[PDB]
């Protein structure tokens, strides 16, 4: 849950870490909480750059 | 498909398209001060950054 | 509001009729959820949970919103009848039924709630009559002024009765929905931080 | 005609959760197609509105 736009890049940073634990835990269905917050912040799923 | 609505918090209204160039706005009126506004936004502030449309305030 | 079969107004129903139609085209199933929270301005006065000073439960949202008392059968029917109206559209479209019970919670003022900063809204006069009618025991006194304050020993029998009564309300709604929708699937949303780390001993013992 | 961005995204195998109180203004057609394009394909959970679904009236 994000709410305030000012904490988007901060909260969403921990969101990805929690997702990895869920994938490790084997959760079959995982959803983001808010459609509004997803579009407000504009989150995407991209492979991290191999630069470093 | 891109029109939006706004109204007083004491009423309920939704917008639903039903044709190529037509749409319906069912609503419920509860108070005398109810004011429903169907508006077209020049700039996009609801869609995703990859789904926004170009902004142009010139309607001449 | 008691004899009305469809509590959901037409514009909301129209939105879901088109909304569910698109989902079926995308072949993704839909899950519905309704809560106990209704707008305070329109909420009936006989359903709001009352604290030790009679102030109905309120939320941090503006306009403020109240919660129904789970001990009220009439209030439970209103919420349950909302689920069947929405799920009826799903059967018309050929979808399978999925519904969620939304936040069963005895309000306690966990966060700021105006005057009721931490006052539990568990002292509704109707609830006291029901507690006396079946348990026979008297309501413990004095009424809890703050959840964080230590709980007296004689307060527990009423607290445990409230905790048990909350489970019946959730079960009652589930049975009512499945009464007309035998193939419907039921679920519930759980707050893990509240379960493991309750705000107070009273909070965890009462609302779980 | 106005320019618009429309870039479909690869499916990540996740669902979408939305609230009615935050989507009444937008048409259902725009919401479903936009979310589907991003990659949410299997599940959808909608939280009913708090003050926008029930019937009501005002009186003196």
Swiss-Prot record, chain D:
Role, per record: Assembles to form the non-contractile sheath that surrounds the tail tube. Allows viral attachment to the host by binding the bacterial outer membrane protein NfrA.
Assembly and interaction partners: Interacts with host NfrA receptor; this interaction is essential for viral adsorption to the host.
Species name: Enterobacteria phage N4
Localization in the cell: Virion
Note: It is uncommon for short-tailed phages to have a tail tube inside a non-contractile sheath.
Name of the featured protein: Non-contractile tail sheath
Coiled-coil regions, chain positions: none
């Amino acid at each position: 849950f994000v709410l305030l736009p000012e904490d988007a890049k901060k909260i969403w940073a921990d969101v990805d870490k929690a997702w990895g634990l869920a994938l490790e835990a084997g959760i079959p269905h995982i959803y983001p909480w808010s459609y509004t917050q997803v579009m407000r912040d504009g989150v995407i799923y991209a492979v991290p750059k191999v630069c470093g | 498909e891109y029109w939006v609505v706004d109204y007083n918090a004491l009423m309920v209204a939704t917008i639903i398209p039903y044709g190529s160039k037509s749409f319906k706005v069912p609503c419920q009126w509860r108070t005398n001060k109810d004011f429903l506004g169907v508006r077209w936004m020049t700039e996009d502030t609801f869609d995703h950054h990859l789904y926004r449309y170009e902004t142009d305030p010139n309607y001449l | 509001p008691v004899s009305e079969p469809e509590p959901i107004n037409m514009p909301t129903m129209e939105f879901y009729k088109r909304f569910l139609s698109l989902l079926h085209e995308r072949d993704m199933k839909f899950v519905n959820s309704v809560a106990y929270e209704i707008l305070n301005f329109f909420m009936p006065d006989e359903w709001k949970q009352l604290n030790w000073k009679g102030d109905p439960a309120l939320s941090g949202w503006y306009p403020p919103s109240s919660f129904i008392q789970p001990t009220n059968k009439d209030a439970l029917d209103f919420v349950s009848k909302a689920q069947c109206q929405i799920l009826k559209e799903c059967q018309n479209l050929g979808m399978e039924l999925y519904f969620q019970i939304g936040e069963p919670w005895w309000w306690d003022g966990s966060y700021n709630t105006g005057e009721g900063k931490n006052a539990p809204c568990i002292y509704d006069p109707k609830t006291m009559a029901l507690y006396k009618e079946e348990t026979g025991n008297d309501v413990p006194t004095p009424w809890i002024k703050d959840i964080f304050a230590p709980v007296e020993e004689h307060q527990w029998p009423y607290v445990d009765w409230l905790c048990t009564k909350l489970g019946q309300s959730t079960n009652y709604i589930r049975d009512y929905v499945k009464g007309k929708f035998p193939d419907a699937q039921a679920t519930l949303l759980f707050f893990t931080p509240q379960i493991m780390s309750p705000a107070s001993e009273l909070t965890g013992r009462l609302n779980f | 005609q106005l320019g618009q961005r429309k870039y479909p995204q690869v499916v990540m195998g996740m669902g979408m959760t939305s609230g009615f109180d935050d989507g009444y203004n937008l048409t259902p057609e725009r919401q479903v197609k936009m979310a589907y394009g991003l990659g949410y394909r299997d599940w959808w959970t909608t939280y009913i509105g708090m003050s926008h679904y029930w019937k009501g009236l005002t009186a003196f």
